[PDB]
RNA sequence: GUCCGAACCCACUUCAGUUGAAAAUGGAGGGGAUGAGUUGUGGAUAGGGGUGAAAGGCCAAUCAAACACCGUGAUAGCUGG
RNA sequence: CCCUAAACCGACACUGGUGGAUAGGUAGAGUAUACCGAGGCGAUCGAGUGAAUCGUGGUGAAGGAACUCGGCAAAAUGCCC
RNA sequence: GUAGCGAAAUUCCUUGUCGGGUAAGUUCCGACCUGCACGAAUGGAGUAACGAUUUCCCUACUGUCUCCACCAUGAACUCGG
RNA sequence: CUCGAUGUCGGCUCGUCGCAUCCUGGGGCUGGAGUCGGUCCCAAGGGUUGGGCUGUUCGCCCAUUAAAGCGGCACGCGAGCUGGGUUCAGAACGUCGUGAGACAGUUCGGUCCCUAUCCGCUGCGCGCGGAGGAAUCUUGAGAAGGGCUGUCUUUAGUACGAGAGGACCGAGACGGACUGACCUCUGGUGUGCCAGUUGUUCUGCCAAGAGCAUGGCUGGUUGGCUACGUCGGGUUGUGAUAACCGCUGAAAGCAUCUAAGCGGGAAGCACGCUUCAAGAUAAGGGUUCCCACAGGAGUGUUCCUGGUAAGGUCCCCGAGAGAUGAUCGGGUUGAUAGGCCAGACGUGGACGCAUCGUAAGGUGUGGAGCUGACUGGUACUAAUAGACCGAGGACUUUCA
């Protein structure tokens, strides 16, 4: 099949506006010495650590 | 252990078997490995089965582990270092932690690593 | 769950002899004949045991009048008066489906401890 | 299960050796015949000395199916060849003898003569 | 308008029994557990007669304040599920009353209602029994096609209600006239002769047979 | 100008492709496979002509008369503007 | 320097076409096929996910051409003595 | 219009008629001749062997079908380019 | 009307509609002993088979069936399939033509593309609204599905009939087809599990194994999915009616089913059964929870910002869910998944050792070893840590 007619501006924009992305949320690193933003349930790219303030564990050597 | 339900890694179940076995071998070789989320979570059960089998050291057990792995050096590592490291552990010999994503293809990446500290 | 199993224990029986596929077995099956009832003996070779609790069942193959007849009995069925073991076979398979296409000397089973 | 074009052997001594199911009696659109079901057959092969000729349309009752048969007590019965027994149009055998084992489902108040002539009712 | 007895339970699975005629009967095992009357609906206040039953084990940290207040007014401990039973004898039910599987006897016919197992997006050949096309004889990439879906310039449209592919399963299904085989109330177990909708662990509503029996 | 069968040459059936991987192919089979075989290099035949185990086939990816340029801004009671 | 090609002929870094030489081991009659050697590659977007559906393979109770224009496709058969 | 052949790759009527095959055969095969409109090197009638030719039948064999189910995969589907 | 293209036969698939009804339901008249019929009134709810021949429609035939209805929808349906027929180029036969060629004569062969924009339709979400914000359970305006039928037994050899023959109205049992759910049973599957085995390469070798050859090929096979499987379903009924049968009864001193009125009367109509359903913007109802925040402008406060309550989402572990969204469960106060331990299922006797045999191998130790989904335990691993959204006494009017 082929598009019979050129789609109107209103309809084209109605469909196109739904092509979008949500913002990445980010969470503050539990390490007091780092305090950076990292993905939830993900090792902090700055400190390379994971876990709560108390039981922190190194994950990435960075 | 349990099969993978969905489509297999590497475009073929035989290749998935090869991938999982090599990935477990590399995990045992290096202690830790960054291997994306799905591969790590699929290799975890096999790796823990192998570690549990290696927790008790007999010639028959070493041959059974060598059925997998197939690198006797890695078999020696598993039966000498990893095995005795888990004398008191009742399972859970490995852990997986997410790292981020790959820029090239947005693969969610994670590191799977054998437990290092002694339970006692 | 184990609730299913404890319910099954009410239906399971206890007087079942121990046997394997490959063993010669006479099953004393109760047959209803209108007002009458009878015990008819089905003698044959156990070719399969599909296990599991009260669902356990076993298949017996008989050669009668040049034709093979296979009967599948639930191991805990109340229609079975009793089970007799004649020979203990020496087989290598859990399911003796290959005996379907064998007759004569090629269809006979070695005895246990031979 | 016996459907149209299924070829069966004969447990009678009428001389017919092989039948071809032309129809399964018991209702429209009915697919299969089981132990004790009546079928319309044609005689594909017959003994030269006999009272039935090849190409004759007859009625038979199915005995000795190969597939399986369940019974209300949860047991199953299975044979190694699809057989049938010809009838005289009133529920009675055409032949005077029955060959091989016969299913118990024939003794559901219906085929008393066949069950009586049966060498073995399993 | 009809008086219905009812109880809530969980599908534990199936097994098999032998009845007194030595017949093998498939039985579904329903943990027809204790249900409590959380709320009674009357024509004066609600406009119809029905009884709301509870049933279910719930964690104290997973029950919210509105639910906790509802159960506190009912005077009972919180339950996971809440299902109503449209009965014309709702009045005879008092708030917080105890209901157990022994509400059904050894040979009552019942109707069992549950949500069927899901199948995802199913094809026409599966969710409607469509006969597709042949496997050979030139069939061109349409072996499981739905065939035609209408006529021509008249009506130049697809009629409403035509059966096509879609998501099948996970829906309210009631299976009727199942004869209860046995009830053991001291542990809340019901053996019902038949197969009931839903996966193991689903919630089931066991009501008196609407059509009484066969 | 035997038989079976790879290479090689072919193109019978089927499926896929059919804005293709490909302006004719791919997968699975299939015919010939010491012969009227197949193939490399160079050469010869040219447009009312060539060549053709002959289908009007082929003659530089559309041949009941190639292509290019010229007569030429051919002509068209026809269609469009 | 490429050269049974990503460098030539195909508009492409194109599942096509392209003449000759060398061409080991085991199973095998074999230059078929399977796994290997000398040697060379991992293929030029990926990561996931049990949807329908299409393509490509696999298996199947009982029946066995009732399919269909037609046994189309598939299955069976298959080698040596 | 002879030999021979004929409802034929030719027969309109036509599913001619009879016979065989099938439970049922507008096709088939053997006959009849009433050859619309056979016929003797545009050869007549036959013919072992040969045929990816056309047609009919038997057997074996099977997802062709009764009646589909399930498995794995390249697309489809979600995310990044 | 369409030639700057409206693709032309039959089958397949999917239906939908009409009734001029094939079956099943009801009723009159019969040239209606019974049994059956044949007429033509009602009636479209459901059902209306599989094959042989032919490209066929048609038609004939075989075997059934309660019956094998007739028609419309571009002689329904080729951006759904089929290409056998038709209607291209090849060739042959007959006939016609001097010939090139022709033939609603025949014969063999013969390319058929499309990634869906709009409406339509099957599903599934996001948003906003439902005059505060929420959580749960609901009513049903309205919508959809479902509606088939046989045989036998009994009434009863009763009624009827000269006999032979053989009922109505009821009662019971067992089926076919269709269909919903489902996996206990049976069957199938099986890229997991166990086992055997061929060729070959490898782990130095023995021993024990690994890779590849379709999972190399075979024998099995739990879970899941499924039908060929097992459970259930159609109904028992209610109301108003069709044809029709009536009651009372005039106009018309009688009569008349009708003019006043009342009653019977079908699988059809509407309910009964099942399912969806308040976007039913008419946005419903019950029960429960949270609460009169803060700061600005302001012009009756208005309205815009900001932090919250009840509550919810994101994220993570999952499956009873699933294309993706969604749905449901769990998230340390925790059994959600994996692992671990035990069991069951499955396979069928591991390695090692002993012993027997020249050897291939046999026996024992030992229902061994291995082992997924199923079951029960167990925090060993990961469900860290955190963010974000979300009312304000909630517009106005009148009542009480
Ligand atoms: C059996 O009747 N059916 C319905 C017809 C038909 C059926 C199958 C086919 O395969 C073809 C045809 C028509 C012809 C038309 C031819 C024509 N030409 C010969 C003049 C033409 O004009 C063109 C063109 N390029 O325009 C073509 O295509 C053409 O050559 C060709 O190939 C054709 C086919 O393929
Ligand atoms: Mg729009
Ligand atoms: Mg699976
Ligand atoms: Mg991929
Ligand atoms: Mg492989
Ligand atoms: Mg077992
Ligand atoms: Mg099909
Ligand atoms: Mg195909
Ligand atoms: Mg329109
Ligand atoms: Mg030759
Ligand atoms: Mg070449
Ligand atoms: Mg060709
Ligand atoms: Mg094609
Ligand atoms: Mg040859
Ligand atoms: Mg030259
Ligand atoms: Mg020509
Ligand atoms: Mg050319
Ligand atoms: Mg010219
Ligand atoms: Mg001039
Ligand atoms: Mg001009
Ligand atoms: Mg014009
Ligand atoms: Mg090279
Ligand atoms: Mg190339
Ligand atoms: Mg190039
Ligand atoms: Mg050799
Ligand atoms: Mg090779
Ligand atoms: Mg090398
Ligand atoms: Mg190279
Ligand atoms: Mg490239
Ligand atoms: Mg997916
Ligand atoms: Mg196959
Ligand atoms: Mg199998
Ligand atoms: Mg089969
Ligand atoms: Mg078979
Ligand atoms: Mg056969
Ligand atoms: Mg046919
Ligand atoms: Mg047909
Ligand atoms: Mg073929
Ligand atoms: Mg083959
Ligand atoms: Mg003829
Ligand atoms: Mg003719
Ligand atoms: Mg004839
Ligand atoms: Mg002459
Ligand atoms: Mg001449
Ligand atoms: Mg001539
Ligand atoms: Mg000649
Ligand atoms: Mg000749
Ligand atoms: Mg000849
Ligand atoms: Mg040829
Ligand atoms: Mg045949
Ligand atoms: Mg893909
Ligand atoms: Mg993309
Ligand atoms: Mg146009
Ligand atoms: Mg009418
Ligand atoms: Mg109809
Ligand atoms: Mg209607
Ligand atoms: Mg006709
Ligand atoms: Mg119609
Ligand atoms: Mg048409
Ligand atoms: Mg169309
Ligand atoms: Mg054609
Ligand atoms: Mg055509
Ligand atoms: Mg001739
Ligand atoms: Mg002439
Ligand atoms: Mg043709
Ligand atoms: Mg499409
Ligand atoms: Mg309603
Ligand atoms: Mg509406
Ligand atoms: Mg099970
Ligand atoms: Mg099985
Ligand atoms: Mg290798
Ligand atoms: Mg093979
Ligand atoms: Mg299973
Ligand atoms: Mg009167
Ligand atoms: Mg009157
Ligand atoms: Mg041993
Ligand atoms: Zn940090």
Q: Residues of B numbered 25-64 whose beta carbons fall under 8 angstroms of chain A's beta carbons: which are they?
A: none
Residue pair E38/E53 in contact (Cβ under 8 Å)? The answer is: yes
The verdict on whether residue E70 carries a ligand-binding annotation is: no
Residue of B nearest to A57 (CA): B97
Between helices B37-54 and B13-30, what is the axis angle to 10°? 70
| Among E15, E18, E22, beta carbon nearest to C7 | E15
Residue pair C7/E181 in contact (Cβ under 8 Å)? The answer is: no
| Residue D72 tokens, joined | 């209300």
Q: D83, D65, D63: which is closest to D16 by C-alpha? A: D83
Which chain E residues 110-139 have CB under 7 A to strand F?
Answer: 138
Contacts C1 to E, Cβ<8 Å? 12-13
The angle formed by the CA atoms of residues B47, B49 and B51, to the nearest 5 degrees, is 70
Residue of D nearest to E23 (CA): D73
| Residue C64 tokens, joined | 């009668």
Q: How remote is the CA of residue A29 from the centroid of ligand 14, in Å?
A: 82
Query: Where does residue B5 rank: exposed (0-12), middle (13-18), buried (19+ CB within 10 A)?
Result: exposed
Q: Which residue is nearest to nucleotide I315 (CA to C1')?
A: A40
> Residue B76: left (phi > 0), alpha (psi -120 to 50), or beta?
alpha
Contacts E31 to C, Cβ<8 Å? 3
Q: Determine contact: E212 vs chain D, CB below 8 A.
A: no
Q: How remote is the CA of residue D78 from the centroid of ligand 35, in Å?
A: 20
Residue pair E97/E34 in contact (Cβ under 8 Å)? The answer is: no
Buried b (16+ CB within 10 A) or exposed e, E123-155: bbeebeebeeeeeeeeeeeeeebbeeeeeeeee
- State which residues form the domain around C46: 1-114
Enter the resolution in angstroms. 2.8
Q: For residue D69, list its beta bridge partners.
A: D77
Query: Where does residue C55 rank: exposed (0-12), middle (13-18), buried (19+ CB within 10 A)?
Result: middle
Q: How many domains does chain C have?
A: 1
Q: How many CA atoms lie within 13 A of E201 on its CB side?
A: 2
CA distances from C35 to A2, C65, D75, D114 (A): 78, 29, 21, 20
Q: How far does B67 lie from chain A, in Å, by closest CA?
A: 31
Q: What are phi and psi of D107, to 5 degrees?
A: -90, 50
Q: How far apart are CA B40 and CA B23, in angstroms?
A: 8
Measured from the Cβ of residue E199, the count of other Cβ atoms closer than 10 Å reads 14
Beta strands in chain C (DSSP E): 24-33, 36-50, 57-64, 67-74, 80-85
**Nucleotides on chain I within 7 angstroms of protein Cβ:** 12-16, 48-51, 62-68, 73-74, 76-83, 112-124, 134-140, 144-145, 150, 175-187, 191-193, 203-204, 207-213, 215-216, 219-222, 225-226, 228-236, 273-276, 285-290, 310-312, 314-318, 320-323, 329-331, 333-335, 338-341, 344-352, 363-364, 367, 370-373, 375-376, 378, 380-387
Q: How remote is the CA of residue D38 from the centroid of ligand 75, in Å?
A: 56
Between helices B59-67 and B37-54, what is the axis angle to 10°? 160
Q: How far apart are CA E13 and CA E28, in angstroms?
A: 6
Q: D116, D77, D66, D81: which is closest to D11 by C-alpha? A: D81
Which helix (H) or strand (E) element contains residue E177?
A: strand E172-184
Residue pair C48/C97 in contact (Cβ under 8 Å)? The answer is: yes
Nearest nt to D20, CA vs C1'?
Answer: H23
- State which residues form the domain around D13: 1-122
Which helix (H) or strand (E) element contains residue E114?
A: strand E109-115
Q: Which are the contacts of E151, defined by CB distance < 8 A and separation ≥ 6?
A: none
Measured from the Cβ of residue C62, the count of other Cβ atoms closer than 10 Å reads 16
CA distances from E160 to C10, E45, E155 (A): 54, 40, 12
Residue pair B55/B81 in contact (Cβ under 8 Å)? The answer is: no
Q: E16, D69, D120: which is closest to C74 by C-alpha? A: E16
Place of tokens 């004398």: B87
Q: How remote is the CA of residue D6 from the centroid of ligand 35, in Å?
A: 10
Q: C48, C50, C64, C56: which is closest to C98 by C-alpha? A: C48
Q: Which are the contacts of E208, defined by CB distance < 8 A and separation ≥ 6?
A: E4, E5, E6, E104, E108, E109, E110, E111
């Amino acid at each position: 099949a082929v598009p019979k007619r050129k789609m109107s501006r209103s309809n084209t924009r109605h469909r196109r506006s739904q092509w979008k992305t949500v913002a990445t949320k980010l969470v503050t690193c539990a390490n007091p010495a780092c305090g950076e933003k990292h993905l939830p349930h993900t090792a902090c790219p700055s400190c390379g650590g994971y876990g709560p303030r108390g039981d922190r564990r190194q994950v990435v050597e960075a | 252990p349990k099969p993978t339900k969905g489509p297999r890694l590497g475009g073929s179940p035989a290749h998935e078997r090869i991938i999982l076995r090599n990935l477990a071998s590399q995990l045992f070789e290096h202690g830790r490995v960054v291997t994306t989320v799905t591969k790590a979570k699929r290799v975890r059960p096999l790796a823990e089965k192998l570690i549990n089998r290696a927790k008790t050291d007999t010639v028959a057990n070493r041959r059974f582990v060598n059925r997998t792995i197939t690198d006797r050096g890695i078999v020696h590592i598993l039966f000498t270092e990893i095995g005795p490291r888990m004398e008191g552990r009742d399972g859970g010999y490995t852990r997986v932690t997410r790292i981020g994503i790959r820029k090239g293809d947005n693969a969610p990446m994670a590191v799977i690593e054998v437990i290092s500290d002694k339970v006692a | 769950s184990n609730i299913i199993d404890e319910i099954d224990k009410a239906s399971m029986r206890d007087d079942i002899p121990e046997f394997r596929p490959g063993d010669s077995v006479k099953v004393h099956v109760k047959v209803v004949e209108g007002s009458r009832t009878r015990v008819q003996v089905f003698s044959g070779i156990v070719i399969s045991r599909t296990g599991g609790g009260v669902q356990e069942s076993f298949t017996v193959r008989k050669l009668s009048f040049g034709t093979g007849v296979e009967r599948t009995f639930p191991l805990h069925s109340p229609i079975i008066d009793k089970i007799e073991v004649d020979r203990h076979g020496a087989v290598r398979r859990a399911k003796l489906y290959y005996l379907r296409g064998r007759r004569g000397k090629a269809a006979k089973i070695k005895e246990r401890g031979s | 299960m016996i459907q149209q074009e299924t070829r069966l052997k004969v447990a009678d001594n009428t001389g017919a050796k092989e039948l071809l199911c032309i129809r399964v009696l018991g209702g429209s659109k009915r697919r299969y015949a089981y132990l004790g079901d009546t079928i319309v057959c044609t005689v594909k092969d017959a003994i030269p000395g006999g009272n039935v000729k090849k190409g004759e349309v007859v009625k038979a009752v199915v005995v000795r199916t190969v597939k399986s048969h369940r019974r209300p007590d949860g047991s199953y019965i299975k044979f190694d060849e699809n057989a049938a027994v010809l009838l005289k149009g009133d529920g009675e055998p055409r032949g005077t003898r029955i060959f091989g084992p016969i299913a118990r489902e024939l003794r559901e108040k219906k085929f008393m003569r066949i069950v009586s002539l049966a060498p073995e009712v399993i | 308008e009809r008086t219905v007895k009812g109880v809530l339970g969980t599908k534990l699975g199936m097994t098999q029994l032998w009845d007194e005629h030595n017949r093998l009967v498939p039985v579904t095992v329903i943990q027809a557990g204790p249900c409590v009357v959380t709320q009674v609906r009357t024509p004066e206040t609600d406009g119809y007669s029905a009884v709301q039953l509870g049933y279910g084990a719930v964690k104290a940290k997973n029950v919210t304040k509105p639910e906790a207040g509802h159960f506190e007014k009912a005077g009972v401990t919180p339950r996971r599920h809440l299902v109503e039973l449209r009965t014309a004898d709702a009045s005879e039910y008092t708030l917080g009353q105890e209901i157990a599987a022994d509400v059904f006897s050894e040979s009552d016919f019942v109707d069992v209602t549950g949500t069927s197992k899901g199948k995802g997006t199913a094809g026409v050949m599966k969710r409607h029994g469509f006969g597709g096309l042949r496997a050979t004889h030139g069939v061109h990439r349409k072996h499981r096609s739905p065939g035609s879906i209408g006529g021509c310039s008249t009506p130049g449209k697809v009629i409403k209600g035509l059966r096509m592919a879609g998501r099948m399963g996970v829906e309210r299904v009631t299976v009727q006239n199942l004869q209860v085989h046995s009830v053991d109330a001291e542990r809340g177990i019901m053996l019902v002769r038949g197969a009931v909708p839903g996966p193991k662990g689903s919630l089931l509503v066991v009501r008196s047979a609407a059509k009484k029996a066969a």
